[PDB]
Design a protein around this ligand. Structure first.
Ligand SMILES: [Cl-]
Ligand SMILES: [Cl-]
Ligand SMILES: [Cl-]
Ligand code: NA
Length: 90
């Protein structure tokens, strides 16, 4: 039940506290990895932990904070690799 999740988030998702929103919910859920601003205005999330935790995080990612407007989320799941010690933003 440990897994890795990839998500990329499109819309009004930069400059609206989106990464900090992902982070707080990741910390609440025990999830490690990062939320990364991409050069096309989208956001990438790379997250590791228990699959049900990741699923809860994905629910939050699809909404974002009040200031965001999430248009689309592409996501996938793969084998847990155990690569992270905490949840960061950059
Ligand atoms: Cl942010
Ligand atoms: Cl982990
Ligand atoms: Cl992978
Ligand atoms: Na994508």
């Amino acid at each position: 039940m440990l897994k890795r999740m990839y998500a990329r988030v499109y819309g009004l998702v930069q400059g609206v506290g989106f990464r900090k929103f992902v982070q707080i919910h990741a910390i609440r859920l025990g999830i490690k990895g990062y939320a990364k601003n991409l050069p096309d205005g989208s956001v990438e999330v790379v997250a590791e932990g228990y699959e049900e935790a990741l699923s809860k995080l994905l629910e939050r990612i699809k909404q974002g904070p009040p200031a965001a407007e999430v248009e689309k989320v592409d996501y996938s799941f793969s084998e847990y690799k155990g690569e992270f010690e905490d949840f960061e933003t950059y």
